[PDB]
Amino acid sequence: SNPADHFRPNLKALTLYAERQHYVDRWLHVKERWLAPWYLPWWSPLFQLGTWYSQRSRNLFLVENHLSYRPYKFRRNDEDRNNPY
């Protein structure tokens, strides 16, 4: 155990936490702000690049109908194999 502990980075300085929802929402706000102006038509390749793949992924998530249960990505405890909740 102790010898195994010698293989860690030795210059850790700071750790920051952020919820997926929050920064995803902020990114969406930024994307809307930059893609909103009239001088960027919806048919431009840039706008489609920005929007279409995200729309496709979200639609795929919504359409999903799985017989099994997928535990919440951001639980408080995900180390117990016998407690998905």
Binding site: S1, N2, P3, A4
Partner: protein, 78 residues
């Protein structure tokens, strides 16, 4: 009934098994040098070159033995 048991002494057994891997490594190293002697007597002009390749093979063969020896230490010290 649900019973959970934790045997401490098993780590010794796993450690001894890994040591068996050294039998192949130790034998493999001897194989290289045996060929080296039988090769130097067939072409002594290259003895220095052959000696270099033999040492290279020894390290590669030895490197594997260390992998097993690491696992021995991991279990012997946990």
């Amino acid at each position: 009934s649900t019973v959970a048991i934790s045997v401490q002494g098993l780590h010794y057994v796993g450690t001894g098994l890994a040591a068996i891997a050294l039998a192949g490594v130790g034998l493999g190293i001897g194989t290289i040098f045996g060929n080296l002697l039988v090769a130097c007597a067939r072409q002594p002009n290259l003895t220095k070159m052959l000696f270099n390749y033999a040492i290279l093979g020894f390290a590669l063969t030895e490197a594997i033995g260390l992998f097993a020896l690491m696992l021995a230490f991991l279990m012997l010290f946990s």
